[PDB]
Design a protein around this ligand. Structure first.
Ligand SMILES: *[C@@H]1O[C@H](CO)[C@@H](O)[C@H](O)[C@H]1NC(C)=O
Lengths: 48, 49
């Protein structure tokens, strides 16, 4: 009714972005080795 | 007891024979022996780092 109601619904367009659709993935980091050594003479244990 | 077998160029109480290492270390007899002395499978001196 004139001088009444007049309700406004607005659709603001904030932004348009070119998003990514990820495929495969994996994880990685930094690694360092540690070694334990044992020296045995011949015919000792499995020194064959 | 290996304390009885004489050391090379030494005196002992029992005739004693063995393998190559024993004959290199101790005196292996030329007569009838009383015991057989083999070298230890894995023995030695163990050192840790
Ligand atoms: C000597 O001893 C080792 C263990 O130190 C063993 O594995 C090996 O079979 C032995 N060898 C023989 C009995 O000829």
């Amino acid at each position: 009714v004139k001088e009444d109601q007049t309700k406004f619904l607005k659709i603001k367009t904030v932004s348009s972005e070119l998003s990514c659709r990820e495929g495969q993935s994996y994880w990685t980091g930094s690694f360092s080795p540690k070694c334990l050594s044992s020296r045995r003479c011949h015919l000792v244990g499995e020194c064959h | 007891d290996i304390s009885q077998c004489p050391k090379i160029g030494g005196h002992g109480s029992k005739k004693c024979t063995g393998d190559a290492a024993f004959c290199s270390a101790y005196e292996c007899t030329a007569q009838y022996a009383n015991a057989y002395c083999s070298h230890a499978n894995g023995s030695g001196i163990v050192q840790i780092q």
